[PDB]
Amino acid sequence: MLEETEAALLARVRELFGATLRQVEPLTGTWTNEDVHRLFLAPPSVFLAWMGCGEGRTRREVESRWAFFVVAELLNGEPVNRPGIYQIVERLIAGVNGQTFGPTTGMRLTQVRNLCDDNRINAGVVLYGVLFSGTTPLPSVVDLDSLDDYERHWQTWKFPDETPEFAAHINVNQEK
Template identity: 45%
Template sequence: MIVSTENALLARLHDVFGNTLRDIATHPGDWSEEGLRDVLLTPPSVYLVWLGAQAGQVKGVIDSRFVFYVVAEVINGAEGDRPGLYQIVARLMAGLSGFRPANAGPMRFEEGRNLYTEKQGNGGVVLYGIYFTCEEPVPALMQDDGVDEYLRHYQTFTQADGSPPFAAPITLRRGHTDDE
């Protein structure tokens, strides 16, 4: 549900912006110095991330919250030859408000926020968060035969004493319950 909604939103952004932006992608996933630097070095761009959800008003439905991080070199690109924050945000809001991604309900604009930091100010870019919500149906519980790919996974364990972490393969038994 989240993946199909995100993919539909990314496709919509590509339709709305065409080749006017340098990058349209899922947010890299972390706010480390390196991750932030990568985002700030690619204006004009839009990055998407799912922020989470809360219970919907109807059983089997959640209200998902998405943020679109808009990175631009200028606030208003009307006087120049590149899209500014105002132009990107206006097009994003027009293109997404009411849009129905995948099996989700229509996108609803919630708020826009200036995410200014000293780091971005020193880099000569602006960063804004444009927040939308939509209702998403919760899929039915997967059958046991649909989780084969998750029966074996790898987990990394850290040690409190400072020893290096170690990875261990974990294999779950099919049909295992907590009562056994």
């Protein structure tokens, strides 16, 4: 039930921030050392990336680890709007803490890394990154449905192969 959860977080982010964030888009893979030169950042924007799932309490639940990578612009060594980016990070933490998002519930904040080395400083982007862990259940077993009239019951006693066969072809619903 992970995809429904990520859709829920994305919808919540869109509702909370609206036009403040230029875009929101799921990220394939954690933020590596070349994501800056490969993605359509269009800052300011936030990316939701699934970082996997550790073992949950039961055999039907897991601790999913999501991440929110927030992007902005740092022209001339100066963030484009430092109060804006701080407010974005803070409101993203606040509105996505504790509240359930689809099947997943108990979103708990785990870590916030500055996550701005030279690769991103010379690229004019800040990458404050939030992490989350949630108790998400596994999908249930697929149900079934069929109705066929019970009419015949074929039983075969497991005798030795070449021993003469013993069986009963019951054929219920027979009247005489």
